């Protein structure tokens, strides 16, 4: 929800380093989707972000594989008015890796890796 809204790229990058400190796959997958996925040309551009290693559970969701708040918003603005296709690019370059062997095992990624 916060990333679909306007978030600065420096903020998302710093928070990516934070969330890679306490490594949790789903959140850093969402951050990488906001940062380094270019769906228009089947492009992952995971470049200058200096991440230590890479887990296949991270970039896993990058591969293609309730109207509650809206009705609340519509009611309250009414009251406000009344009161008024594979992806073939994978680029992992400037991230200072030390062993790419984590991607080597048969994870949930290899069909995309082929």
């Amino acid at each position: 929800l916060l990333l679909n809204s306007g978030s600065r790229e420096q903020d998302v990058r710093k928070a990516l380093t934070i969330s890679i400190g306490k490594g949790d796959s789903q959140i850093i997958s969402l951050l990488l989707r906001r940062l380094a996925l270019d769906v228009a040309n089947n492009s992952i551009c995971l470049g200058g972000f200096c991440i230590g290693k890479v887990e296949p559970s991270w970039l896993g969701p990058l591969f293609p594989d309730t109207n509650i708040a809206s009705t609340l918003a519509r009611m309250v603005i009414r009251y406000q008015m009344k009161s008024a296709e594979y992806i073939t690019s994978l680029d992992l370059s400037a991230n200072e890796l030390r062993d790419i062997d984590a991607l080597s095992q048969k994870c949930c990624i290899s069909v995309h890796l082929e």
């Binding site: 790229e9 270019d38 228009a40 040309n41 551009c45 470049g47 200058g48």
Partner: protein, 822 residues
Amino acid sequence: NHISSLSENFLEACPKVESFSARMNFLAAMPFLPPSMTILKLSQNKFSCIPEAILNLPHLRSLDMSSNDIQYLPGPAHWKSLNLRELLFSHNQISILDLSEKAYLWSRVEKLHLSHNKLKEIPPEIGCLENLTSLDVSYNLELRSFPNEMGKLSKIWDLPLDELHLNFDFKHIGCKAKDIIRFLQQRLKKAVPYNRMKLMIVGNTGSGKTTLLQQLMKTQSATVGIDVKDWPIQIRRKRDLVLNVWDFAGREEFYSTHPHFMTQRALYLAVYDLSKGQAEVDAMKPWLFNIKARASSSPVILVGTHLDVSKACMSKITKELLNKRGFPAIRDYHFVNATEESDALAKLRKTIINESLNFKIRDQLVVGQLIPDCYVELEKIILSERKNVPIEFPVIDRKRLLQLVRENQLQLDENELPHAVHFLNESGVLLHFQDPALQLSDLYFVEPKWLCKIMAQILTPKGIISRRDPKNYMTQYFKLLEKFQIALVPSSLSDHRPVIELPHCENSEIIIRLYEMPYFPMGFWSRLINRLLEPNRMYWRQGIYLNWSPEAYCLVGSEVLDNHPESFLKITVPSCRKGCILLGQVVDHIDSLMEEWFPGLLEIETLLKKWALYSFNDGEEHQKILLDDLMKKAEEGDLLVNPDQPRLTIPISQIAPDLILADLPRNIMLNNDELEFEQAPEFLLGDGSFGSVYRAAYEGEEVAVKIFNKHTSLRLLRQELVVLCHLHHPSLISLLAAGIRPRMLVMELASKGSLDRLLQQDKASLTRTLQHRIALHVADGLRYLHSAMIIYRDLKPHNVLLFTLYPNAAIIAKIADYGIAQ
């Protein structure tokens, strides 16, 4: 690679190679290249001669054998190839450019580089190579010639002329370099000789300056202006010679405009006024020093103009002190009565003529130079237009000049005409200033004596005056007077300095610098004050004192020293950061003034000692020790300056904050500590080779350092830095560090390289939104530069430096703002 010799069958079964490049390898001979080559790059190899195997490839297209020990070049009738397009032979021991056998075989040749070689003379068969684009014969220093046949190489757009003797030396340089081919072509058309030079009579305050001129041409008020005349000399050696005489004004009131009329191609006379013997010779020394500072290569023939009185051995001081001490080349001297003719006056005529015929700067004999006949026809036209235009307004409109040249059938188009009128202003026929800051692009003063009598007429608190009295061209008067350093007038302005006090006197917070010279040049102080108004400036004749605060001010005085005949120039500034900024701006202004107006000073004793002062004890400094600026600059490796013992020291930024790069805003300090960088390995040099661009890790981040070679100047570097210091746009390559030891530059590193390589190699990445983001970022940079009131003048995919390929990024494209630096 450290290969010595290739195998004889090394490319035996590879019959499709094209670009076999073996650069900086210890190679000696080419063993049987295949016949399918196009380009070879065999430069920096231990070659002794062009090997015969390369002379038989029937499809060779380029050849790089620069920096090789080769002597003889085979002529164009041995190459056996009909598509040669780029022969590069820089830095070789080649002597002859023999193009005489069959020169038409090289008609398709585009580039040709014979720089840095022992070439003797360019052969005149060069004119058939109709497709030359960049002929490089620079850095030879033994050529001193150009055949008139090379005016046919119209496709040439650039022609390097660095460090080589010249013949025309017409002050037009190869910055255009196609006009040079136009002049060579027009000289190939007609090639008429030329016989005209200037004779500037120089003296002071009443001497044989006009009467001597009245007797010399075999023909009384004091001079006002410079009183341009001329007289021909029919030399019987049948040489029709005319030379115009410029008897300069004598009184010191006109001494702030004579540098506008002292050129290097003239013969000067210096007049004694020998009535007051042995002192007027001593009084003549500022004139000789000014001649030396203005025209370093022009001879001066002295004349004593009172043989009616005696003090007879006044030539003793001339033979002792006036020979060679920083004074110009005194070729002769005489003594005359200068009222009626004599054997002395007759031999004065003969020596003046004989010294005129043998001027020969750089052994070129300027008295008999060669020009196209279009120049002489324009000269006759303009000299007839002087009588055709009345004395009320001899200024000539540019369109009127075009109508005059269209009134006749001269081959002068609008292209060569600026150099035409520049050369005619050089020989003193019509004065015209092509400076676009002046409104003289349509003002061409025929009969320049009118201009000199008018513009000097005005000189006939204490010194200021506003507009107070010309047919509605008064703003031309005012703009010319500003151009002539007349406007308030800097001359006749309150010679008495005031008794100024300063808020800072503790002799540690005051930076002082001296600029010791023997005399002040003629129009020095007017040019300095005019170029220094860029702040209650309470100035006088020889000072400024513009003041912003006790914390920020300046004082460009003129101190005089006890028991010192040499003059001085004392720059006082406080020692805060703003003081260093002001000092740097002032020093750069002064150096630019001397380089642009008096080159005779800054040439080899060097005639101008830039000093520096420093105190050891703060307060009661006891005559701050003078230190020359040159070896203080040479003490750059030691950033502190100390006495004979290290019990004290002073940082160089304390007493010379221009050498140490601190006068500019301190964000671009070099800071050599965290610079993980090695200029040696070419791994990092892969970030660019045409400029010395490398890759380095600095302050933890990755940078793209640029090492400056010896083609730059420190003052020019500082000029480049100050404009590059404060741009700071997100589509601009920002700077991170700059300084000395070595002269380097730390700019940001573009990851994906330039744009041209991307569209050349990886054209699948441009995807209709990356294209648009690149275009938008470049347009943002251009709009910022235009809002920076500067031009770029070279925009190309060679300069669009990319940072990422993600389309929805913050920054993608950045431009190289070093193009504004050159």
